[model samples]
Target: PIMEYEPVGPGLIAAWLKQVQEHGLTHPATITYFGVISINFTSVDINMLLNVTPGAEKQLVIDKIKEKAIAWDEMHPPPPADAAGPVPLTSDQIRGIGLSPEEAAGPRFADARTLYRTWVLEALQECQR
Candidate 1:
């Protein structure tokens, strides 16, 4: 992360944020980011060791950092497997596969249902403030 800042080219900080989100605040982990990091989180707290820090290639830091943030946020990877489960099939479609409505309605298609539930939970978790 803090290592190859120039690797991500345009979004050094933004890429760092993305990695942190998927990996760490701690922006995601809550306490890592090379020498500059939140030693302790906000009262989740008390690292109270108290507090936070980056640099540039001696070039354009502003444009690069900003672009990185936007680019990272705009990414549309398949979310997390847990963020979106399998697609759904109409009940009739399910029946076409040879299952009765009653069965399909029941745990007969629990797999897809399970997937739906998984995705829903993940997406909702993020919706929390």
Candidate 2:
């Protein structure tokens, strides 16, 4: 699949986290953002990682997400650097998901780098609660 960045189904990541909480971190989890981006995360106890890498001071977590993004990008042959980029969600699409204008207009959904961090930070927040 191509490396397009799209907003995931609402609460899908949260549902995956619920499974993680129920089965403990030994149960591997895979979340696909549409058909474009998929991550099969294994063996890492995200909650524990969150503890070790505090959310308020989340330098490590940010770096880890960056690593994941780089690995995913490297798997595909380079698309023409000037190829039309992935189409972003419209303002209506963003609003339909109950997200803010800033999220639609801002860096969170702008590209893979920012999008990965958005998901990581969101998953971290869910795991913390």
Candidate 3:
């Protein structure tokens, strides 16, 4: 049976969230320092737009993304007693998110986002769904 694949963008976001789960949302972790590109469509937005019947293959990928997203949120719940203001990471901070100072100095950071970009695109294209 043919399986509908999720869009590449959200798939990559799912991949990113996986890393966030592993590394965490702190100073040394990658997600805390860098910004992610927009998903372009939310779960409900995709639900309306996909127009797929329930339990379709396309919905599986969406479900996967939603699961990971919810898990990440649960792992990083905001403080209940008090909330703190946000301080955006700076250019210097982006450089430091890498595994090492030297790795950040080069183009390695692009690999995670861009590499996943191509990974999902090619994977979906070959899905033949």
Candidate 4:
């Protein structure tokens, strides 16, 4: 599942900038932005090495890094056929199985395809920017 960011408000932006200034751009928080996603701040990496680092904060950073990395991995190289286990029926197949030819040929199918295309491709492109 995609990790959802809450609607960014003024307060959230301010707090986030302050945190970035104090802690430097940690991977977990930086991954939420586009350009910052590629930045590797050595200071933050070293700070994480300190023995007295707060356990909860460190865990949060680790968790976010793992989550984002897994998401990216899934996007780039999807699971193999063997890992996916079984070949499930596609959307068209399901519609064909459940509806008559004439019914399945209606405009609803085209509409659904257009919506899915916009979501998967267009929306993702916008997010990546």
Worst 10 residues of 2 by lDDT: 40-49
Q: Please provide, for model 2 over 1-129, each residue's C-alpha lDDT reduced to its tens digit, 9 standing for 90 to 100.
A: 113324433365565445445544222232222112234211122222333321332454345544544555555434467788564433223222343423433445345323443456444344331
Give the candidate number with the greatest TM-score.
Answer: 3
Task: Give each model a TM-score.
Answer: 0.22, 0.26, 0.27, 0.24
Comparing candidate 1 with candidate 2, which one achieves the higher lDDT? Answer: 2
- Winner on lDDT between 2 and 3 is 2
The candidates, ranked best first by TM-score, are 3, 2, 4, 1
Residue-by-residue lDDT tens digits, candidate 4, 70-106: 5544555544666853433243322233444344335
Report lDDT (CA) for all predictions. Answer: 0.31, 0.37, 0.35, 0.35
In candidate 4 the C-alpha lDDT for residue 114 amounts to 36
Using lDDT as the measure, which candidate wins?
2
Clashing pairs in 2: none
Winner on TM-score between 3 and 4 is 3
Would you list the clashing residue pairs of candidate 3?
Answer: none
On a 0 to 1 TM-score scale, where does candidate 4 land against the true structure?
0.24
